Design a protein around this nucleic acid. Sequence first.
DNA 1: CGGCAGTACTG
DNA 2: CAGTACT
DNA 3: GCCG
Length: 320
Amino acid sequence: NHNLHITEKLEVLAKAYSVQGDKWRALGYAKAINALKSFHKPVTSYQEACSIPGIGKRMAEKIIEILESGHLRKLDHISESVPVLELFSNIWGAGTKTAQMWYQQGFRSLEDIRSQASLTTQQAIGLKHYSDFLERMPREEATEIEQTVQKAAQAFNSGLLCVACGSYRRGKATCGDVDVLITHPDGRSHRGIFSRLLDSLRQEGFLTDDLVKGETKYLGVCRLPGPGRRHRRLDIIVVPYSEFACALLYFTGSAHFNRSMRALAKTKGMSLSEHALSTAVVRNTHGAKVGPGRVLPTPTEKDVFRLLGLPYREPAERDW
DNA sequence: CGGCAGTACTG
DNA sequence: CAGTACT
DNA sequence: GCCG
Ligand SMILES: [Mg+2]
Ligand code: NA
Ligand code: NA
Ligand code: NA
Ligand code: NA
């Protein structure tokens, strides 16, 4: 990053807009920061700034203030509530609306939340694991967790395929959580497996809390055995084999990469989801789908790129 | 002006 | 539904 | 916030 002295100041504003609910402005900032982090050389001119996609007049102005003064005056006027809103929205299951409500109600600390807030079932688990969920784990521990799930799944049906996606599959040295995708090549035997799989992972104490228990998605909490272990977030998705490539693509990410790819598909009259890549998609004036279109066959990730007119990118090149 | 990705789950 | 979450 |  050639522009740390700029992006460090910009990230502060972005986070402030985010926790305060100004999601589109925060999005704009996030995109400007990534763009700034990817420039080859320090940005030294307004006109150079404007030349970067993702940097407009308002943002170039801010970059200019930083270079000339080493500071951004807007930082001095960030609401005093922001550190508390961030504290609160780092509880899993609480977002900006809940954080703002707790703030309005007078809460200022996690002790206030613990003792006086009404928490959802998910938020109570999030609070119990507040520190742990803010920590990343070594890649090697994500391997142990993925293997734990795979061993439990394969015990039921040895044909089940399980793959850790997310940051793990993108090759990162640490992972915020573990994202396990499960399918079955025969196209049928993925069905109805959660009850038995989840029950199995509970039996020996690996699965400690459940956050979401859907027909296709599980989100919860696990902890490996022995001393020195922290609770870790674990997501499991079970998909039919026909959707494997799009599910793999979605669940490998990154999130920004997915949004970029999906926006591209939209420009070409297509739609990309975790279920499928579709063509001849009918939309309205607001970009909203009014007609479904046709599912395109995508046996592999490479086919999704191909049909979008893109060169294939290995997971490591998707870490946007 | 107005989209900014597309979807699953909860209560 | 609004809110939160996933990548 | 940026961009079509
Ligand atoms: Mg993840
Ligand atoms: Na630009
Ligand atoms: Na949260
Ligand atoms: Na109090
Ligand atoms: Na996850």
